[PDB]
Structure 1
Amino acid sequence: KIQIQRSGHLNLYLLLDASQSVSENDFLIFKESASLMVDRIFSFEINVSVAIITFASEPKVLMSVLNDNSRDMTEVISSLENANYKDHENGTGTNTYAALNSVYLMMNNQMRLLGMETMAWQEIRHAIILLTDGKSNMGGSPKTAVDHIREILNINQKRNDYLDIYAIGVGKLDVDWRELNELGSKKDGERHAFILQDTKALHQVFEHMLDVSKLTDTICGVGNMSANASDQERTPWHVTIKPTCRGALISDQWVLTAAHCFSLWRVNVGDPKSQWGKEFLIEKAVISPGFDVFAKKNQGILEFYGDDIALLKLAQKVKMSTHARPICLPCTMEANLALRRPQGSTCRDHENELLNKQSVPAHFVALNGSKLNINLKMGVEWTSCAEVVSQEKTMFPNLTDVREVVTDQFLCSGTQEDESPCKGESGGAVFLERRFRFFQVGLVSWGLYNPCLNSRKRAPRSKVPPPRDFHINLFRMQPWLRQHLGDVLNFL
């Protein structure tokens, strides 16, 4: 596997077959796949260098781990996007040996400049990925280059982890499966050779080529994008609150949730040992003191969710893992770096960054742990989304203005095909995904139809009022968030 961890350095070598057996179209699906792996590899904030080599009769180095810019993702993506298939128009053979001996020489060059004795050289782990139909036809057996590489890297039983070779045939084209399989590493328990139909199938496979198990620092908003990973792996900030409500780990001790959900309190966090999770006690609970559901009741608004926000300090720290991680909060320095945004960004800038469109795809997690889909409505579409509460005359018998219930404190979704949260889904993250990282923009507070009242009913199209969903917007809650968390999290 390609290991995602804080110790050491990762050199990733991306080898793109531009031989005569591949069209400029095959070649573009290689570039598209390599691009994705780069963006995914740069999502974890680890020390990584990317080499980019296209190859046919001979190898062409577009980017080298010896160059500083190989640690810079913009330089990498651009070195990659300036790859022309036609640069190999004069030697269209498939010389796999020479492509790998190209990586061998880069490694020899690097060891030379660093010194084979230094930790600079020796802590580097190396992953080669060839994107090819695998039909070598010149240059000799690539095994000669793989063995030179195993030798310079002093790969022994104790150093198996320092080298992975992948051979991946991605797209329409006819693939030699024996060449691929003979290319990739031979490690017990894992595959290094794949035949995949598009870049979407690469996305999923790439998730399982990564080993993130020893990534246990507090990095926020990191998750599993595999359809085959568990629900918790996909959303590890997600916690269960038994006062049922949901919540989100925002740190290694603190959990964000809804006030309306509230010694006997339990919080179930993710745990890699069990789908069952792990139970924690609360040490301290901070409930916004503006929250009071019946505050407008005597005046005809029978439930009011203004300031529906609460924080839980767990009684012990969570150990971070594939199953327990904070989500990123906007307006923190950590969110800033995950978004790759300029350093002096403001909270207004994060809001613009994350919620710029009039309809923003977002998610909340189901009772069963499934990730469900919503579209957050912004600007003039926020008004129309929110308007429908005038249909709801039992809860809101005396509503003069929409804003007496749906204030500026709420996000709005639940229109058209959106899912709608259920009652026990309250307090959980309303989140989104951007550059493979996860940001909490709101928390489930209330709405007009409860689908669960595993199984969700869809409202009848004739039901009044229609489903509609209102989430406490975290960009509206910064004073209170800062007041309780200024020493817990690093606010812009």
Structure 2
Amino acid sequence: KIQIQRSGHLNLYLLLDCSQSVSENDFLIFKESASLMVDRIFSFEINVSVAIITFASEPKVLMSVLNDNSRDMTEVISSLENANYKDHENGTGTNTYAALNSVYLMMNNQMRLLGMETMAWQEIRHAIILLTDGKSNMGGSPKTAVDHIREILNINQKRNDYLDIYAIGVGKLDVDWRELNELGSKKDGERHAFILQDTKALHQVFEHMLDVSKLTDTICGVGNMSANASDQERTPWHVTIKPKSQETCRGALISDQWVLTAAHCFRDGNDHSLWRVNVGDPKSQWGKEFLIEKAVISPGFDVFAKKNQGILEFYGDDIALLKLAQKVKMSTHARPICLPCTMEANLALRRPQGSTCRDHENELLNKQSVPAHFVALNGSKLNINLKMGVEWTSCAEVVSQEKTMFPNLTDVREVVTDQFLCSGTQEDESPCKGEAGGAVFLERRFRFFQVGLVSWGLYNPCLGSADKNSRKRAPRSKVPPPRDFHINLFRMQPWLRQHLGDVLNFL
């Protein structure tokens, strides 16, 4: 397993087969797989050094770990992009020994530099990922080179975790399972050699090929992405508010000790005692319960303020903050969620230093139909489409049809303030009753950002009490079309900053 932690260095050596035994399409599969792997690894913003060595009858080095540019994602991506399949026409044999000896030469050159006795070299871990069919027909047995690799790093029983050799064969090409198993490192409780069919399965397997368990710093957005993980692992920021043994409103962790939730959950309660926030826990499946010490309600929120004018309910300024009385120990089951208009969101998007949230708004909501997700009652993740631009104008018009609740004309300027986002149109799901406050997030560069929280809607698909899982479907003839809404976080920056200026670092 490729260990992830804040201490040390991770030298990644990606070897790609470039022989006659792999065709051009298989080489494209290998290249896109390596691109995906190098993209995912850099998402954790750790110290990583990546070296690309496409190998054939002779070993050709495309980028050097010793080179100081190995700590840049775009440079490595561009260097891998310039790989050529025809560069090895003179020699089309598979020479695994050449690649392994090139890796050994790189490692020895690094060892001579900076001094072997220095702890900086001692704390370096290695990970060699070979994408090949394994049929190495010349140059010598891989065992000699592997033993040489072990001896240079003196990989004993105690230091067995400092060298990981993988052998992943992805594509239609025939793969000898025995050879791939022999090439991969032999460890007691994990698999190091795989055979696959496409790149999505490789993404899943690579998601299993890491362990963020040793990482416990306050990083936002980072979360699992494999489909075989628990529902809480995929959305660690999901926390829940329990008034009295009931499971009413959801939330999102925005810091070590803060939670952001809708303000209409705390309608008729000022006794913060007996209120418990359920937070995911690595051990128990029901989570650990925390106590809230300060609940802040937006002063501009008043449901019945426009009652006389004809607006039965107006959900403006529907936002609240919670401060747990105890610090949440970050783990693999609970991590914050990236909020925009802050330094960490800028860092997670790999944007220039001199950025402003005016650019963040366009970067994160450029499309006229931006995909987004929110968490269901049972913990699953659903899909919606936030609509901006001219497409937003048609959205609010549908509310005017619902004159049974507000008899007035109810145009966009009156009921649907600019603070709300569309959803629920065409092939889009709608939240049930009991999902208010749940983050409406979106994924960018393998990192999750929050761009709003559920506020209200026009149809509850959980009215039928079949189960907590079954969800009704709105009939096509259902007179009010489903048209949900979510408070937009960007418009609420003036309220956010003065309440969280010290906790975070806003732009």
TM-score above 0.5, yes or no: yes
- Residue 348 of structure 1 deviates from its aligned partner by 0.8
Whether the 8 Å contact between 2:456 and 2:484 is mirrored in structure 1 is yes
Aligned-partner Cα distance in 2 for 1:396–1:56: 73
Aligned-partner Cα distance in 2 for 1:427–1:400: 25
* Match in the other structure for 2:317: 307
- Residue 402 of structure 1 deviates from its aligned partner by 2.2
Whether the 8 Å contact between 2:262 and 2:437 is mirrored in structure 1 is yes
- Residue 386 of structure 1 deviates from its aligned partner by 2.3
Measured against aligned partners, the alpha-carbon deviations of 1:187-240 in whole angstroms (never above 9, x if no partner) come to: 121110010111111110000101110110001000111011111111110111
- Residue 180 of structure 1 deviates from its aligned partner by 0.9
Secondary structure of the residue that 1:431 maps to in structure 2?
strand
- Residue 115 of structure 1 deviates from its aligned partner by 1.1
Aligned-partner Cα distance in 2 for 1:388–1:161: 60
Alignment size in residue pairs: 492
- Residue 298 of structure 1 deviates from its aligned partner by 2.4
- Residue 100 of structure 1 deviates from its aligned partner by 1.3
Whether the 8 Å contact between 2:221 and 2:337 is mirrored in structure 1 is yes
- Residue 325 of structure 1 deviates from its aligned partner by 0.3
- Residue 274 of structure 1 deviates from its aligned partner by 2.1
Aligned-partner Cα distance in 2 for 1:400–1:103: 69
- Residue 400 of structure 1 deviates from its aligned partner by 3.7
- Residue 395 of structure 1 deviates from its aligned partner by 2.1
Aligned-partner Cα distance in 2 for 1:100–1:467: 60
Whether the 8 Å contact between 1:301 and 1:399 is mirrored in structure 2 is no
- Residue 401 of structure 1 deviates from its aligned partner by 1.7
TM-score by length of 1: 0.99
Measured against aligned partners, the alpha-carbon deviations of 1:11-57 in whole angstroms (never above 9, x if no partner) come to: 11110001101111100100000000101000001000000010111
Secondary structure of the residue that 1:33 maps to in structure 2?
helix
Q: Give 5+ residue unaligned stretches, structure 1.
A: none
Whether the 8 Å contact between 2:219 and 2:335 is mirrored in structure 1 is yes
Secondary structure of the residue that 1:284 maps to in structure 2?
strand
What is the aligned counterpart of 2:297 among 262, 271, 287? 287
Secondary structure of the residue that 1:27 maps to in structure 2?
helix
- Residue 405 of structure 1 deviates from its aligned partner by 1.5
Higher helix share: 1
- The 5 A counterparts of 1:105-120 are 105-120=105-120
Aligned-partner Cα distance in 2 for 1:400–1:25: 57
- Residue 303 of structure 1 deviates from its aligned partner by 1.3
* Match in the other structure for 1:317: 327
What is the aligned counterpart of 1:254 among 246, 254, 258? 258
- Residue 87 of structure 1 deviates from its aligned partner by 1.1
Secondary structure of the residue that 1:260 maps to in structure 2?
coil
Measured against aligned partners, the alpha-carbon deviations of 1:371-404 in whole angstroms (never above 9, x if no partner) come to: 1100100101111222211121122222342221
Stretch of structure 1 that moved more, 157-166 or 476-485: 157-166
Aligned-partner Cα distance in 1 for 2:168–2:32: 13
Sequence identity of aligned pairs in percent?
100
Aligned-partner Cα distance in 2 for 1:486–1:35: 38
Secondary structure of the residue that 2:204 maps to in structure 1?
helix
- Residue 144 of structure 1 deviates from its aligned partner by 0.9
Measured against aligned partners, the alpha-carbon deviations of 1:63-122 in whole angstroms (never above 9, x if no partner) come to: 111011111011110110111011111111111121111111110010111211112211
- The 5 A counterparts of 1:144-293 are 144-243=144-243, 244-262=248-266, 263-293=273-303
Aligned-partner Cα distance in 2 for 1:483–1:44: 29
Stretch of structure 1 that moved more, 147-156 or 370-379: 147-156
Aligned-partner Cα distance in 2 for 1:62–1:155: 27
Secondary structure of the residue that 2:14 maps to in structure 1?
strand
Aligned-partner Cα distance in 2 for 1:150–1:394: 76
Whether the 8 Å contact between 2:31 and 2:80 is mirrored in structure 1 is yes
Whether the 8 Å contact between 2:275 and 2:291 is mirrored in structure 1 is yes
Whether the 8 Å contact between 2:397 and 2:411 is mirrored in structure 1 is no
Q: 1:399 to 1:275 in 2, by over 3 A?
A: farther
- Residue 299 of structure 1 deviates from its aligned partner by 2.1
Aligned-partner Cα distance in 2 for 1:349–1:116: 46
Stretch of structure 1 that moved more, 390-399 or 445-454: 390-399
Aligned-partner Cα distance in 1 for 2:109–2:353: 35
* Match in the other structure for 1:460: 475
Aligned-partner Cα distance in 2 for 1:282–1:155: 49
- Residue 60 of structure 1 deviates from its aligned partner by 1.1
Aligned-partner Cα distance in 2 for 1:120–1:384: 60
Secondary structure of the residue that 2:405 maps to in structure 1?
coil
Whether the 8 Å contact between 2:458 and 2:481 is mirrored in structure 1 is yes
Aligned-partner Cα distance in 2 for 1:13–1:350: 34
Aligned-partner Cα distance in 2 for 1:100–1:399: 74
Aligned-partner Cα distance in 2 for 1:477–1:269: 25
- Residue 469 of structure 1 deviates from its aligned partner by 1.3
Aligned-partner Cα distance in 1 for 2:362–2:309: 36
Secondary structure of the residue that 2:292 maps to in structure 1?
strand
Aligned-partner Cα distance in 1 for 2:404–2:190: 59
Q: Give 5+ residue unaligned stretches, structure 2.
A: 267-272, 464-468
- Residue 448 of structure 1 deviates from its aligned partner by 0.7
Stretch of structure 1 that moved more, 150-159 or 255-264: 150-159
Whether the 8 Å contact between 2:396 and 2:411 is mirrored in structure 1 is no
Report the RMSD for the aligned CA atoms in angstroms. Answer: 0.9
Q: Is residue 2:484 matched to residue 1:469? A: yes
